[PDB]
From a paper:
EGFR is a 170 kDa type I transmembrane receptor composed of an extracellular region characterized by four domains (I, II, III and IV), a transmembrane region, and an intracellular region composed of a kinase domain and a C-terminal tail. Ligand binding to the EGFR ectodomain is coupled to both homo- and heterodimerization, which is followed by conformational rearrangements of the transmembrane region and asymmetric dimerization of the intracellular kinase domains, one of which phosphorylates the other to initiate signaling. The EgB4 nanobody, selected from the VHH library directed against EGFR for its non-agonistic and non-antagonistic properties, was proposed to bind to EGFR domain I while not competing with EGF binding, but no structural information is available on EgB4 or its interaction with EGFR. Here we report crystal structures of the EgB4 nanobody, alone (up to 1.48 Å resolution) and in complex with the full extracellular region of EGF-bound EGFR (up to 6.0 Å resolution).
The EgB4 crystal diffracted to a maximum resolution of 1.48 Å. Model building and refinement led to a final model with Rwork/Rfree of 0.177/0.205. Two EgB4 molecules are present in the asymmetric unit that align with a root mean square deviation (RMSD) of 0.17 Å. The framework regions of EgB4, defined as the conserved segments of nanobodies, align with that of a typical VHH with a RMSD of 0.51 Å, whereas a RMSD of 3.9 Å is measured when aligning the complementarity determining regions (CDR). Two complementarity-determining regions of EgB4, CDR2 and CDR3, of which CDR3 is substantially shorter than other EGFR-interacting nanobodies, are at the interface with EGFR.
Author numbering:
A (entry chain B): 1 to 125
B (entry chain A): 1 to 130
The structure:
């Protein structure tokens, strides 16, 4: 089992950047896949990116070329670098982990953080 | 002569990251030094970082190892990547440009943006990184 804690959220101008971190506590972090999901109010919790135990990555089409997922097993930490942020990215961002799956389905991850709020302004504001 | 506009500011959790951009309008952007300066409440506009027209960099001791200044001459844009943000970093951040400046002095830069606000939460709100 792992416990996860996200950090790095904020409220930024469109086109800006943020970096989210997810700090894991528990045994065998290197054996977990890590996922990022996001939920806007009155919307379903959606796949953003995942990284496998071998650093194989997967991204939603909506964030390809803008977001980068990574991990540092020595720090038991995962990261989501978010560049060229858009108002469509506003949401609570959750990190999730699982040893038995590495998919784009939220039901396939059994360990979740509490979430970090990301807010992005309108375009050209 | 260039016109500058900063973007990318915001409010962020202590320990987080931002990236500020400075878009320049005008001729010969690649011939200008670009500086970032910041003004916290009750403070003067202080040097943060500069990049010369030959890509030579200079950082304030308070941001060395956390901030990275860069430029994209093809996009007439400069950048300030800010990692491991601290409450000490809360300020209005200004970009400045000059063809004839090789100093940390705000009087050596003749072209200024209007500023972008950066607000970092309290130290206590930050986690202990591994
Ligand atoms: Zn599972
Ligand atoms: Zn000058």
């Amino acid at each position: 089992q792992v416990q996860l804690q996200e950090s790095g959220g904020g409220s930024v101008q469109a086109g800006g950047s943020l970096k989210l971190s997810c700090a894991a506590s528990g045994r065998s972090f290197s054996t977990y896949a890590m996922g990022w999901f996001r939920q806007a109010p009155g919307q379903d919790r959606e796949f953003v990116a995942t990284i496998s135990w071998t650093d194989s990555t997967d991204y939603a089409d909506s964030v390809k070329g803008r977001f980068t997922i990574s991990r540092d097993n020595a720090k038991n930490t995962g990261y989501l670098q978010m560049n060229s942020l858009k108002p469509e990215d506003t949401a609570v961002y959750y990190c999730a982990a699982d040893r038995w799956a590495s998919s784009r389905r939220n039901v396939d991850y059994d360990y979740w953080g509490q979430g970090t709020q990301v807010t992005v302004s309108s375009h050209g504001s």
